[PDB]
Design a binder for this molecule. Structure first.
Ligand SMILES: N#C[C@@H]1CCS(=O)(=O)C1
Ligand SMILES: [Cl-]
Ligand SMILES: [Cl-]
Ligand SMILES: [Cl-]
Length: 163
């Protein structure tokens, strides 16, 4: 565990993270994909060996000794709002289990289903709250990665509001 477990946000590529493990915003088939998933494929291609896993689940594969937690958020193009919400919450609960099992003191996490799986909606608050719901009972330092300047401000605001 971290001595004083925290949440932070950074605006940069999660493939350059300074944490003990990474969460991939994976597809269910373990394909290289786009966005975060492709950056993760380029950095930790070895972690894509048998990484395929269903929607709402997380599967960890080592790259050397570095854990890559493949978390499959729903594609809101395919799911109803209600079912997509349920699966997005579930993916994050599975990430919390894996982070706990691995015994890491820090984890780099993107906001699941906020990019090409968002169904063209802004899901910052929805995705972040499900992240908090899952990770609040863990003692790892959580570092959230984003790419948009306005999202960095809103995530930072949401973290500070609860401190
Ligand atoms: N990043 C991202 C989204 C989820 C996996 S993907 O690369 O297929 C699209
Ligand atoms: Cl960067
Ligand atoms: Cl996405
Ligand atoms: Cl972003």
């Amino acid at each position: 565990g971290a001595m004083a477990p925290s949440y932070r946000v950074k605006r940069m590529d999660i493939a350059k993270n300074d944490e003990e493990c990474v969460v991939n915003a994976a597809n269910p088939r373990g394909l290289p994909g786009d966005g975060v998933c492709k950056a993760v494929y380029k950095k930790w291609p070895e972690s894509f060996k048998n990484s395929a896993t269903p929607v709402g689940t997380a599967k960890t594969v080592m790259c050397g000794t570095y854990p890559v937690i493949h978390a499959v958020g729903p594609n809101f193009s395919n799911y109803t709002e209600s079912e997509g919400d349920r699966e997005l919450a579930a993916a994050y609960r599975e990430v919390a289990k894996e982070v706990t099992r691995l015994g890491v003191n820090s984890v780099a996490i993107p906001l699941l289903s906020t990019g090409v799986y968002s169904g063209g909606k802004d899901r910052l608050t929805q995705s972040l709250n499900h992240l908090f719901t899952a990770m609040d009972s863990t003692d790892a330092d959580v570092v959230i990665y984003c790419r948009d300047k306005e999202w960095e401000k809103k995530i930072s605001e949401a973290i500070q509001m609860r401190t």
